[PDB]
Design an enzyme around this catalytic site. Structure first.
Site: not given
Ligand SMILES: [Ca+2]
Length: 223
Positions: A40, A84, A175, A177-178
């Site tokens: 994402h 994801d 923020g 994320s990942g």
């Protein structure tokens, strides 16, 4: 990260910032040429920033390297956030040192109750908006699958796990994320989603990295 602590400069040497003119997502360095993040977080034109503490000031330890290719998991579903995960290859190899280092992939899935370290530059408020310039950290346990499924009925797949605090107050956030979830020195999760941040009965949901090791190894050996 809501309710966490300042990690301290370069104490999370595998943490990267993805930059597209601005920081937008985190990621994890798994070897000198590859980063793992969330699907994402895909965009074209990514620059990977390594060795960062303060993302707004050049402190002297950073390496800024453009991505050459991005590989989204072939079964990623943007509607459910199943699978994801994305790989990013760097145009040139990072120089590994004490401030920039790779994190190991798991051979085994982590257990419920295991304390994990989650890190990033995301929002620090559950209500309102405050972005930090320095890297924040949170320790959080993996939750049982039954408490996870109870929190998000009908939404948790086998490729997800929950980590956090059902009482709320402490969580990853927009923020982050990942970014990494590291447990027992291995990358076990990727910051993926949740309902708001740090809400009661709504813990963070993380991509379960141990389900993807074969795909990661195969992909890096061919690209
Ligand atoms: Ca910096």
């Amino acid at each position: 990260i809501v309710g966490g602590y300042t990690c301290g400069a370069n104490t999370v040497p595998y943490q990267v910032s993805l930059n597209s003119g601005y920081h937008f997502c985190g990621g994890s360095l798994i070897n000198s040429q590859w980063v793992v993040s969330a699907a994402h977080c895909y965009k074209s034109g990514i620059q990977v920033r390594l060795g960062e503490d303060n993302i707004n000031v050049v402190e002297g330890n950073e390496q800024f390297i453009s991505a050459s290719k991005s590989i989204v998991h072939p079964s990623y579903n943007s509607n459910t956030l199943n699978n994801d995960i994305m790989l990013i290859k760097l145009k040139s190899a990072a120089s590994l040192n004490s401030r920039v280092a790779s994190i190991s992939l798991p051979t085994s899935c982590a257990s419920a109750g295991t304390q994990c370290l989650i890190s990033g530059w995301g929002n620090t408020k559950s209500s309102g908006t405050s972005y930090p310039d320095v890297l924040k950290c949170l320790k959080a346990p993996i939750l049982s699958d039954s408490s996870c499924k109870s929190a998000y009925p009908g939404q948790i797949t086998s490729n997800m796990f929950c980590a956090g605090y059902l009482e709320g107050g402490k969580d990853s956030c927009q923020g982050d994320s990942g970014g990494p979830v590291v447990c027992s020195g291995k990358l076990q999760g990727i910051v993926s989603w949740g309902s708001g941040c740090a809400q009661k009965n709504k813990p963070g949901v993380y991509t379960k990295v141990c389900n993807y090791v074969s795909w990661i190894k195969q992909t890096i050996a061919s690209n």
